[PDB]
Amino acid sequence: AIAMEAAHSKSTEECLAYFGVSETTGLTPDQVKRHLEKYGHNELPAEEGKSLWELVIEQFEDLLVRILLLAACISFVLAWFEEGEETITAFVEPFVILLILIANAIVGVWQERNAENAIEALKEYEPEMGKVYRADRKSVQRIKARDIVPGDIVEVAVGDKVPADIRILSIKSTTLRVDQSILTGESVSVIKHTEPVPDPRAVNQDKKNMLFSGTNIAAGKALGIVATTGVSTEIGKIRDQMAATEQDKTPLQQKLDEFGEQLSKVISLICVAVWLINIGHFNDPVHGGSWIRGAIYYFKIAVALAVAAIPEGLPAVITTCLALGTRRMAKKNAIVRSLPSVETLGCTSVICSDKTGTLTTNQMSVCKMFIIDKVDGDFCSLNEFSITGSTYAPEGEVLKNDKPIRSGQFDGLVELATICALCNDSSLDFNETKGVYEKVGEATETALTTLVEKMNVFNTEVRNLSKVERANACNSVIRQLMKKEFTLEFSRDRKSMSVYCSPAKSSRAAVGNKMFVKGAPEGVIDRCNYVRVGTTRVPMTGPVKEKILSVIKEWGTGRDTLRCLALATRDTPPKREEMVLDDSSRFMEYETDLTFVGVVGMLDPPRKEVMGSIQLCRDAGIRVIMITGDNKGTAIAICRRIGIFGENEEVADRAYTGREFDDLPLAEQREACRRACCFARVEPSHKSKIVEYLQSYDEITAMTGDGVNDAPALKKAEIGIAMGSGTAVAKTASEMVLADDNFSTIVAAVEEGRAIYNNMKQFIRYLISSNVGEVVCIFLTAALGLPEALIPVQLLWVNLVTDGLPATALGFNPPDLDIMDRPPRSPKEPLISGWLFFRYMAIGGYVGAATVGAAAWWFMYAEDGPGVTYHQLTHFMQCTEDHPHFEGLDCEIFEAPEPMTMALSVLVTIEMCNALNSLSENQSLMRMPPWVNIWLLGSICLSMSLHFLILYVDPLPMIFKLKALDLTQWLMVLKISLPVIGLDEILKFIARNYLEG
Numbered sequence: 001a002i003a004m005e006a007a008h009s010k011s012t013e014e015c016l017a018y019f020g021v022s023e024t025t026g027l028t029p030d031q032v033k034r035h036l037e038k039y040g041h042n043e044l045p046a047e048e049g050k051s052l053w054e055l056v057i058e059q060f061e062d063l064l065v066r067i068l069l070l071a072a073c074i075s076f077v078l079a080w081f082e083e084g085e086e087t088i089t090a091f092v093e094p095f096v097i098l099l100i101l102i103a104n105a106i107v108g109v110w111q112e113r114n115a116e117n118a119i120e121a122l123k124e125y126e127p128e129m130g131k132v133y134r135a136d137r138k139s140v141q142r143i144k145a146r147d148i149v150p151g152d153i154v155e156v157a158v159g160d161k162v163p164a165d166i167r168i169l170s171i172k173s174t175t176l177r178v179d180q181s182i183l184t185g186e187s188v189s190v191i192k193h194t195e196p197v198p199d200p201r202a203v204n205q206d207k208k209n210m211l212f213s214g215t216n217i218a219a220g221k222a223l224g225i226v227a228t229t230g231v232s233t234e235i236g237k238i239r240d241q242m243a244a245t246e247q248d249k250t251p252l253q254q255k256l257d258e259f260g261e262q263l264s265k266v267i268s269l270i271c272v273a274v275w276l277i278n279i280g281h282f283n284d285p286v287h288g289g290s291w292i293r294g295a296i297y298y299f300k301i302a303v304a305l306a307v308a309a310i311p312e313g314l315p316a317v318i319t320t321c322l323a324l325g326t327r328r329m330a331k332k333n334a335i336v337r338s339l340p341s342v343e344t345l346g347c348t349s350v351i352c353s354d355k356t357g358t359l360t361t362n363q364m365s366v367c368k369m370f371i372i373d374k375v376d377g378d379f380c381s382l383n384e385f386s387i388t389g390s391t392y393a394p395e396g397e398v399l400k401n402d403k404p405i406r407s408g409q410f411d412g413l414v415e416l417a418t419i420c421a422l423c424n425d426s427s428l429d430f431n432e433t434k435g436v437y438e439k440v441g442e443a444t445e446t447a448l449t450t451l452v453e454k455m456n457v458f459n460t461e462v463r464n465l466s467k468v469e470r471a472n473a474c475n476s477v478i479r480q481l482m483k484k485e486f487t488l489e490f491s492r493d494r495k496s497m498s499v500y501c502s503p504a505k506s507s508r509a510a511v512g513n514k515m516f517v518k519g520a521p522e523g524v525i526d527r528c529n530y531v532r533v534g535t536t537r538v539p540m541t542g543p544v545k546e547k548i549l550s551v552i553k554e555w556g557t558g559r560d561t562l563r564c565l566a567l568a569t570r571d572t573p574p575k576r577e578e579m580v581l582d583d584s585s586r587f588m589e590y591e592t593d594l595t596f597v598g599v600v601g602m603l604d605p606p607r608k609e610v611m612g613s614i615q616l617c618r619d620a621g622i623r624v625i626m627i628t629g630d631n632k633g634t635a636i637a638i639c640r641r642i643g644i645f646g647e648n649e650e651v652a653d654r655a656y657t658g659r660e661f662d663d664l665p666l667a668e669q670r671e672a673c674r675r676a677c678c679f680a681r682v683e684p685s686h687k688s689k690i691v692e693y694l695q696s697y698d699e700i701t702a703m704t705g706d707g708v709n710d711a712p713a714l715k716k717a718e719i720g721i722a723m724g725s726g727t728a729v730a731k732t733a734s735e736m737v738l739a740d741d742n743f744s745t746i747v748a749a750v751e752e753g754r755a756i757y758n759n760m761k762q763f764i765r766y767l768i769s770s771n772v773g774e775v776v777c778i779f780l781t782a783a784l785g786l787p788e789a790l791i792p793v794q795l796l797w798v799n800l801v802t803d804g805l806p807a808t809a810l811g812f813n814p815p816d817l818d819i820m821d822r823p824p825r826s827p828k829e830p831l832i833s834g835w836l837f838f839r840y841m842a843i844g845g846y847v848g849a850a851t852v853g854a855a856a857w858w859f860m861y862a863e864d865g866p867g868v869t870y871h872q873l874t875h876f877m878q879c880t881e882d883h884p885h886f887e888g889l890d891c892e893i894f895e896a897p898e899p900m901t902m903a904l905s906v907l908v909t910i911e912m913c914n915a916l917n918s919l920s921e922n923q924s925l926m927r928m929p930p931w932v933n934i935w936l937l938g939s940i941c942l943s944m945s946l947h948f949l950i951l952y953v954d955p956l957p958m959i960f961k962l963k964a965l966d967l968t969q970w971l972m973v974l975k976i977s978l979p980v981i982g983l984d985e986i987l988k989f990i991a992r993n994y995l996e997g
């Protein structure tokens with residue numbers, strides 16, 4: 001018994017005992033190390049996978065490979081029992097088949113392993129984490145879930161993942177709800193308690209005092225103690241049940257297997273059609289005149305073709321593509337959770353992004369602020385100000401009219417600054433490490449803390465105070481004046497919050513306790529009946545309200561697009577008891593009969609790149625919808641400002657608020673979505689509905705989200721996008737995660753999606769095309785009787801290079817060139833277009849011709865070379881027998897190692913040229929010089945060394961039936977290959993200047 005048995009049936013002390021730790025200290029470095037060695041890291045077994053060798057063996061089991069590797073033994077164990085003994089070639093022949101076949105598996109394992117690596121390494125970008133308490137310090141630590149030792153103290157809050165099996169110690173919140181969907185199969189969140197369950201053998205649905213490793217905190221916060229980790233996890237003892245869940249294949253991978261297998265069919269027919277037509281040649285003297293031998297040799301030709309020219313692993317290539325793709329993506333702060341996601345991402349047609357934080361920086365600060373100044377019936381003067389310093393740091397002055405003043409010398413600004421600090425839940429904190437201050441709570445509010453500290457409306461000291469105390473200086477001071485009794489926080493219905501305070505130097509304070517109100521101006525204003533003019537209060541007249549509002553609009557609608565709130569108090573607050581501090585609806589009741597003090601106005605600029613990334617979207621034909629927390633006015637403004645909306649365009653109907661939407665009928669809602677770009681003050685549901693309608697127009701939609709309650713809409717979206725600083729519960733629902741929470745990154749991701757598509761297309765063209773040619777060649781020698789240009793072994797070598805090195809080097813092609821200037825790709829369109837197929841044949845076929853051509857040339861038009869048998873090079877089987885056409889031509893010439901070291905000498909170089917045509921799908925080599933993909937270029941040279949080496953190191957060429965050639969002859973190779981560069985080039989030009997899309 002290594003595990004703590006039935007903690008579900010124990011008390012909190014019985015659990016704090018078994019390991020021995022306090023919920024203040026946590027596990028000491030000692031016990032940390034001790035449990036780390038006795039129980040081990042909280043993670044599954046480092047499963048091995050397989051060995052190279054064994055995998056190679058597995059690959060050696062094909063119908064064709066078993067057949068061929070045997071059909072070569074027959075022709076060898078026969079070439080020994082004949083009459084005419086020169087056995088060396090037939091001896092080494094089936095062995096080379098073996099060596100080559102092995103080298104197939106070599107690259108096989110090589111590339112798959114490469115694909116496997118780009119999978120695992122994705123997880124390095126987003127490790128598992130959790131909050132713990134250990135003896136080190138009394139603060140909250142975060143660590144990788146593998147670093148959690150069964151025994152330490154775990155902290156869980158709204159949006160986190162239970163990193164281990166914990167027994168609940170303290171329900172920090174009030175109602176603890178847990179998303180156990182992954183294990184218990186119960187999506188609906190369950191409530192949790194600290195009472196001990198009786199039955200130790202109780203089912204999960206009963207152990208409602210336990211939190212399971214992989215379940216998600218849905219509502220509230222909690223503390224607990226770890227009982228088991230590693231494999232003994234309630235989930236870990238089930239993960240042995242299913243190890244293989246890659247159940248599903250993208251419609252693209254599908255469409256590809258469909259086509260590629262369908263090609264396998266044609267490749268097979270025009271294979272046993274090659275062997276079949278050569279039946280009258282089963283009795284030739286060279287075959288010892290044996291039907292059996294005849295069928296053996298040509299059977300080798302057909303099968304050898306089958307084995308090479310057949311597509312070795314199409315589904316693998318897609319994989320190679322995504323692997324490599326996701327690697328670049330993740331490197332760009334685009335963490336792609338699912339694989340199919342990426343394929344889809346290319347087709348992204350719509351992007352729903354949130355303004356706050358994603359489209360803007362969220363560097364919250366207060367730009368301007370105003371208060372009433374003089375009121376005389378219709379005369380109403382304002383006090384406009386400006387506060388310098390966009391930072392969260394209190395390093396700025398409060399200008400008035402471009403001249404700095406002293407906030408304190410205005411009573412309006414006094415009450416103002418107080419409201420701020422006393423309506424503030426967050427505050428600041430100087431950080432020593434980074435050497436800067438940082439928010440502590442909601443940034444909206446913090447910017448307020450900053451303002452107060454900048455205002456210093458009590459002239460308190462600063463320079464003599466440390467940069468640590470400095471941060472909460474004036475704030476503390478304001479707390480010294482007022483005691484925060486209770487708070488009535490926000491509610492999207494009334495749009496505000498209030499606090500309640502009593503004076504400092506006062507014990508019997510009846511008419512000394514006040515109420516501080518901060519909320520959106522819209523509303524806060526309408527519930528104001530008085531206006532504070534310095535330390536006075538005059539009745540809140542129409543005209544005043546009228547002006548107040550005019551400014552608020554100027555600011556919000558201005559080239560500053562300012563989020564501004566209105567601050568006010570209640571001098572006549574209901575009895576410290578008359579308030580029932582429970583019901584939200586009642587809270588607005590108490591927040592009436594107010595005095596309007598002032599209006600702050602605040603900024604959170606849009607990320608620099610954004611403008612550009614949006615303009616780009618327009619180019620790539622993608623649509624962009626901003627969802628924001630601002631009113632329609634400000635939202636439209638922001639939209640105009642960042643290029644979502646034009647400077648002058650009529651947006652009347654292209655932007656909605658939650659309300660407006662809801663006040664629409666559904667048939668018209670669906671209608672809106674088709675042209676909407678800006679949504680404001682919407683509810684979490686609205687997202688999902690928006691997505692819905694966007695689907696209804698066959699849009700591929702990216703949806704940003706980061707809230708627990710976002711999860712449904714994200715999940716409904718084609719591409720869910722969760723923020724890196726978002727709920728993990730949100731991320732579990734999303735297809736991709738934004739490391740840098742940036743809208744610009746989204747856009748880059750989409751671009752990458754498109755580029756990957758291209759690379760997939762590149763690896764394909766060159767594959768399929770090369771192989772097309774690989775067949776036509778061997779079919780021509782069969783359709784013309786020509787002494788075959790390549791023999792089985794020669795062909796399997798070339799193949800074993802073409803799809804071995806220069807092929808994989810295409811996995812290193814850079815992105816294309818007009819990739820973003822075209823409209824988004826449709827998931828509906830076919831993988832290989834009609835024109836593309838033709839392109840494949842054109843090149844492919846061409847390669848066969850220049851393969852038999854290379855032979856044809858060394859004979860008929862054989863310059864300075866033997867043969868020169870102009871006509872009837874066709875029949876060569878009529879030579880030993882019917883030789884009245886023989887003239888200075890020995891028969892053993894159609895068996896010369898020259899036409900071979902021509903065909904093959906050309907093919908290998910033609911494949912190099914083809915590899916270069918496959919840099920860009922449509923873009924010329926003039927626009928995309930071949931010196932662009934260094935790696936590919938490298939493969940060429942490597943391959944070239946092997947070709948030379950199989951011609952110049954005697955063991956090789958002899959065994960391969962190949963004699964090297966002179967320069968006067970290499971010229972023919974080039975003069976015969978390079979025309980492909982040009983042919984494809986021509987074709988690309990038509991695809992380019994005629995069928996752009």
Ligand SMILES: Nc1ncnc2c1ncn2[C@@H]1O[C@H](COP(=O)(O)O)[C@H]2OC3(O[C@H]21)C([N+](=O)[O-])=CC([N+](=O)[O-])C=C3[N+](=O)[O-]
Pocket residue numbers: 355356444445490492495496497518519520564565627628629630658681682683
């Ligand atoms: N559905 C909605 N309907 C109306 N207003 C909303 C809505 N959603 C958010 N808001 C308000 O829009 C703002 C968010 O940007 P975003 O990132 O959300 O797009 C939010 O700021 C405050 O109320 C919020 C707020 N608060 O806790 O959330 C507290 C406030 N306070 O009293 O201190 C004031 C808010 N305010 O808007 O004035």
Ligand SMILES: [Mg+2]
Pocket residue numbers: 307308309310771774799803
């Ligand atoms: Mg092949």
Ligand SMILES: [Mg+2]
Pocket residue numbers: 354356
């Ligand atoms: Mg938000």
Ligand code: NA
Pocket residue numbers: 714715716717718719720733734735
């Ligand atoms: Na989803």
